[PDB]
Design an enzyme around this catalytic site. Structure first.
Site, PDB file in Angstrom:
ATOM      1  N   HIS A 233       0.767  -1.180   0.103  1.00 52.70           N
ATOM      2  CA  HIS A 233      -0.083   0.022  -0.171  1.00 52.70           C
ATOM      3  C   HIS A 233       0.762   1.327   0.122  1.00 52.70           C
ATOM      4  O   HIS A 233       0.490   2.194   0.646  1.00 52.70           O
ATOM      5  CB  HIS A 233      -1.061  -0.118   1.226  1.00 52.70           C
ATOM      6  CG  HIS A 233      -2.012  -1.071   0.881  1.00 52.70           C
ATOM      7  ND1 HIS A 233      -2.191  -2.341   1.671  1.00 52.70           N
ATOM      8  CD2 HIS A 233      -3.258  -1.179   0.199  1.00 52.70           C
ATOM      9  CE1 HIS A 233      -3.219  -3.081   1.260  1.00 52.70           C
ATOM     10  NE2 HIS A 233      -3.596  -2.268   0.348  1.00 52.70           N
TER      11      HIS A 233
ATOM     12  N   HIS B  13       1.064   1.429  -5.841  1.00 53.92           N
ATOM     13  CA  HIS B  13      -0.287   0.751  -5.957  1.00 53.92           C
ATOM     14  C   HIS B  13      -1.178   2.050  -6.211  1.00 53.92           C
ATOM     15  O   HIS B  13      -2.078   1.759  -6.976  1.00 53.92           O
ATOM     16  CB  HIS B  13      -0.648   0.133  -4.517  1.00 53.92           C
ATOM     17  CG  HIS B  13      -2.138  -0.197  -4.383  1.00 53.92           C
ATOM     18  ND1 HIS B  13      -2.816  -0.941  -5.169  1.00 53.92           N
ATOM     19  CD2 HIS B  13      -3.143   0.420  -3.374  1.00 53.92           C
ATOM     20  CE1 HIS B  13      -4.102  -1.144  -4.950  1.00 53.92           C
ATOM     21  NE2 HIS B  13      -4.238  -0.329  -3.923  1.00 53.92           N
TER      22      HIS B  13
HETATM   23  O1  LIG Z   1      -7.876  -4.641   3.880  1.00 55.13           O
HETATM   24  C1  LIG Z   1      -7.668  -4.305   2.540  1.00 55.13           C
HETATM   25  O2  LIG Z   1      -7.881  -3.261   2.295  1.00 55.13           O
HETATM   26  C2  LIG Z   1      -7.037  -5.221   1.751  1.00 55.13           C
HETATM   27  C3  LIG Z   1      -6.839  -6.497   2.078  1.00 55.13           C
HETATM   28  C4  LIG Z   1      -6.253  -7.263   1.415  1.00 55.13           C
HETATM   29  C5  LIG Z   1      -5.927  -6.882   0.053  1.00 55.13           C
HETATM   30  C6  LIG Z   1      -5.449  -7.908  -0.952  1.00 55.13           C
HETATM   31  C7  LIG Z   1      -4.477  -7.203  -2.016  1.00 55.13           C
HETATM   32  C8  LIG Z   1      -4.093  -8.429  -2.661  1.00 55.13           C
HETATM   33  C9  LIG Z   1      -3.175  -7.856  -3.900  1.00 55.13           C
HETATM   34  C10 LIG Z   1      -2.642  -9.164  -4.786  1.00 55.13           C
HETATM   35  C11 LIG Z   1      -2.898 -10.417  -4.337  1.00 55.13           C
HETATM   36  N1  LIG Z   1      -3.472 -10.806  -3.390  1.00 55.13           N
HETATM   37  C12 LIG Z   1      -3.973  -9.782  -2.511  1.00 55.13           C
HETATM   38  C13 LIG Z   1      -4.739 -10.147  -1.600  1.00 55.13           C
HETATM   39  C14 LIG Z   1      -5.025 -11.336  -0.984  1.00 55.13           C
HETATM   40  C15 LIG Z   1      -3.979 -12.093  -0.964  1.00 55.13           C
HETATM   41  C16 LIG Z   1      -3.805 -13.621  -0.488  1.00 55.13           C
HETATM   42  C17 LIG Z   1      -5.450 -14.106  -0.239  1.00 55.13           C
HETATM   43  C18 LIG Z   1      -6.345 -13.039   0.041  1.00 55.13           C
HETATM   44  N2  LIG Z   1      -7.596 -13.534   0.334  1.00 55.13           N
HETATM   45  O3  LIG Z   1      -8.778 -12.802  -0.196  1.00 55.13           O
HETATM   46  O4  LIG Z   1      -7.885 -14.609   0.461  1.00 55.13           O
HETATM   47  C19 LIG Z   1      -6.150 -11.953  -0.765  1.00 55.13           C
HETATM   48  N3  LIG Z   1      -5.393  -9.145  -0.676  1.00 55.13           N
HETATM   49  C20 LIG Z   1      -5.754  -5.583  -0.316  1.00 55.13           C
HETATM   50  C21 LIG Z   1      -6.435  -4.625   0.439  1.00 55.13           C
HETATM   51 MG   LIG Z   2      -7.643   0.310   0.456  1.00 61.09          MG
HETATM   52 ZN   LIG Z   3      -6.089   0.148  -2.745  1.00 60.77          ZN
END
Ligand SMILES: O=C(O)c1ccc(-c2cc3cccnc3c(-c3cccc([N+](=O)[O-])c3)n2)cc1
Ligand SMILES: [Mg+2]
Ligand SMILES: [Zn+2]
Ligand SMILES: [Mg+2]
Length: 335
Positions: A84, A88
């Site tokens: 972040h 991004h």
């Molecule tokens: O709380 C938030 O604002 C937030 C939380 C998670 C992500 C995020 C980004 C990813 C980008 C690229 C690959 N993976 C991303 C993941 C992610 C990675 C592994 C598992 C999961 N999932 O949802 O199970 C999600 N999460 C973004 C924003």
């Molecule tokens: Mg956000």
């Molecule tokens: Zn974002």
């Protein structure tokens, strides 16, 4: 001159210009833009997008005020946060810029709506600490209490994005009318709040409704004469931009995954060091990167993009294809 041309002074002008040839393409490499802009991907990409769309002229925004605001905004993104950070933000702004140009949505949005969407993308994660809303909530953050635990960080990104406008020579909306400013503020608030991952389902549900009640013209362009429908599509577009990593080239996608995993592990160690219970995905000692990406796509990213692809069919088919291919690749990498 570098500044007048890119909004940033760089020692790699020729190389930055080559990368910027893909400004309107889903395949633009933002990592390279960062590398040829002295790591000012957000300022550079926002300046390029605004010049491309002629937004500075349209909204009477001086190049100086804009560059001053963008540089300040970018300075407020953490460089010590793995995912972040401003890269991004730059990526989401550029992705949104491409999404707004989808043939199926041609002439659908007003210029103010376009301005609001790109602006929202740029500020959507400003001053992100690298920990989730739940972590802020679980640790009784003053920020969490302040926003009654709802869209904690999203409300913070909005507060910061707007407040910076009050900085010296930073008010890029100084020449908008009271009405345009009110409209823009409400739309930006709507789009940033739409990046709150906990709102995913409410957004997708609306998007399906938009697909079901879909209406196109002879040319094939969608019909959205009313703001009430358009704001639902804009909220989902920025959400899709925010969840677009898996739809990019595998090379880009793999870098995005490495970054988010590092950030997750950062929060995991914070929780760990505070005798706290480590959150899901944040335990570097038990994380299954590949299997998690497959779950991410199957349950969240694909369901969203599939619906978006239906809405603008067939403009986003290659994006869906890429998503599917990337999904199968990570699936084949599961030990
Ligand atoms: O709380 C938030 O604002 C937030 C939380 C998670 C992500 C995020 C980004 C990813 C980008 C690229 C690959 N993976 C991303 C993941 C992610 C990675 C592994 C598992 C999961 N999932 O949802 O199970 C999600 N999460 C973004 C924003
Ligand atoms: Mg956000
Ligand atoms: Zn974002
Ligand atoms: Mg901070």
């Amino acid at each position: 001159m570098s500044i007048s041309r890119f909004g940033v002074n760089t020692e790699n002008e020729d190389h930055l210009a080559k990368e910027l040839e893909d400004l309107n393409k889903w395949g633009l490499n933002i990592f390279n833009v960062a590398g040829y802009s002295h790591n000012r991907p957000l300022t550079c990409i926002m300046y390029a997008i605004f010049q491309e769309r002629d937004l500075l002229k349209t909204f009477r925004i001086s190049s100086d005020t804009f560059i001053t605001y963008m540089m300040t905004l970018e300075d407020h993104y953490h460089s010590d946060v793995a995912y972040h950070n401003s890269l991004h933000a730059a990526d989401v702004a550029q992705s949104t810029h491409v999404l707004l140009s989808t043939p199926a949505l041609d002439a659908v949005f007003t210029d103010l709506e376009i301005l609001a969407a790109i602006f929202a993308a740029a500020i959507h994660d400003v001053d992100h600490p690298g920990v989730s809303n739940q972590f802020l909530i679980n640790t009784n953050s003053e920020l969490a209490l302040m926003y009654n635990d709802e869209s904690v960080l999203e409300n913070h990104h909005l507060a910061v994005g707007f407040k910076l406008l009050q900085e010296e020579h930073c008010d890029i909306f100084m020449n908008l009318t009271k009405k345009q400013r009110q409209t823009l503020r409400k739309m930006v608030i709507d789009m940033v709040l739409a990046t709150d991952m906990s709102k995913h389902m409410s957004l997708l549900a609306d998007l399906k409704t938009m697909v079901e009640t879909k209406k196109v013209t002879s040319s094939g362009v969608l019909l959205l004469d009313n703001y009430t429908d358009r704001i639902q599509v804009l909220r989902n577009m920025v959400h899709c931009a925010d969840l677009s990593n898996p739809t990019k080239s595998l090379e880009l996608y793999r870098q995005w995954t490495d970054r988010i995993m590092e950030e997750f592990f950062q929060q995991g160690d914070k929780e760990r060091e505070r005798g706290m219970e480590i959150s899901p995905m944040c335990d570097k000692h038990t994380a299954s990167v590949e299997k998690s990406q497959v779950g991410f796509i199957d349950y969240i990213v694909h369901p969203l993009w599939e619906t978006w692809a239906d809405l603008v069919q067939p403009d986003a088919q290659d994006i869906l294809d890429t998503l599917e291919d990337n999904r199968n690749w990570y699936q084949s990498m599961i030990p």
